[PDB]
Amino acid sequence: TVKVCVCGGGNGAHTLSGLAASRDGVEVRVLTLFADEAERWTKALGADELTVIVNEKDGTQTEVKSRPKVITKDPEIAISGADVVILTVPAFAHEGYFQAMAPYVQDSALIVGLPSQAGFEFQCRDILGDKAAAVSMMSFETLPWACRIKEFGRKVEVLGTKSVLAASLIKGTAKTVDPLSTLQMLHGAEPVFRLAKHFLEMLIMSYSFVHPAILFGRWGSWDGKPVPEAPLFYQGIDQATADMLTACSNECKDVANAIMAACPGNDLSDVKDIYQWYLEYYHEDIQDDHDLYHAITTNKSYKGLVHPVKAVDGGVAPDFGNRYLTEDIPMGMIVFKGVAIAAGVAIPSNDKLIMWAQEKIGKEYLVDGALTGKDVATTRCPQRYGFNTLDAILTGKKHHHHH
């Protein structure tokens, strides 16, 4: 029997629990530390089955029904004897789950971030301590489905499923269940999972600059005057933003190259240009693909998507109380920044974005090119956890001197 632990009670956690609990030979334990959410779930479900409505490519709707073994807030019941522990929550909530699982997780455990975001492995190492070298850490690039809860604790809808999905793996000393095949088995036929080459490849291929760049590209030097309707998000970028995106993508390659130079044997050669990525994964959606500006603006799977806005005097204004910045910076760019600091590479385009965007969310992270802001402790950058050098970043082992 494969014993799987699902962390969280969101859209993803609902979708994952339903599909995993339906696979024969799988026991699912659902753990949520959000107040008394676990109890609310159990009470809402009752004796009924957790229903997952999948919208297939045909237009037809497949219906999956299953019951998890237990939905508890007690980390002892959920974690003990778990072969796979999967975290499906926004990143600010990951710190709590690592602490909860710390005493009860077994050596042979496979810890999965679905999705991980950035600094997942640095955080896991810090909290689990020595045990992180035993377990295996697995980082997915994004959530496998676009999904929304239809009825809390009992009904969730898959709007669509990705076809391909990459996950990075850090193999520990202990032998786990096979990372790729076990995760595939739980998910079903789609997405088809492949292993990435390196975890830092996964970390930077997040492209944590994208949403902060689109928001800066439109509201950078905003005078305060309102607009009629909400302007288009991805498709509303000007040329200055396509150049801003390329410069940050170039800086991603810079950090990737420095690491391969400083530490050979770390294959980071799968780190691309954002222009190269778009033309590989959105090829069927792009009308005109001659540059990055046109690849994004004419991308059909971006139509109707607008900026977050709120009603103000004489129109609408940008809503900033979102997870575009309060997530992608502390749990994305700052991590990348710390890695770049350790790599000894300047990243001016990324720096410009960090400084503007932190100020919009009333937070301090980066100060004069140094990780010394007020809220630097709420970020997952490797320097925050004590890992100051590139070697400490790759291995998790800190330098101690004699004699």
Ligand SMILES: NC(=O)c1ccc[n+]([C@@H]2O[C@H](COP(=O)([O-])OP(=O)(O)OC[C@H]3O[C@@H](n4cnc5c(N)ncnc54)[C@H](O)[C@@H]3O)[C@@H](O)[C@H]2O)c1
């Ligand atoms: N939903 C999607 O289709 C979509 C698509 C791609 C990627 N993602 C990403 O995947 C991640 C997970 O998606 P989701 O929709 O399940 O997130 P979600 O918004 O549904 O997560 C909410 C859950 O997180 C936990 N939580 C929320 N606030 C908490 C707090 N204050 N303290 C402790 N726990 C708290 C609770 O268990 C809650 O049920 C997100 O970060 C999102 O960016 C989502």
Ligand SMILES: NC(=[NH2+])NCCC[C@H](N)C(=O)O
């Ligand atoms: N998993 C990735 N490589 N993502 C790159 C694009 C990321 C970007 N933040 C988006 O949602 O479009």
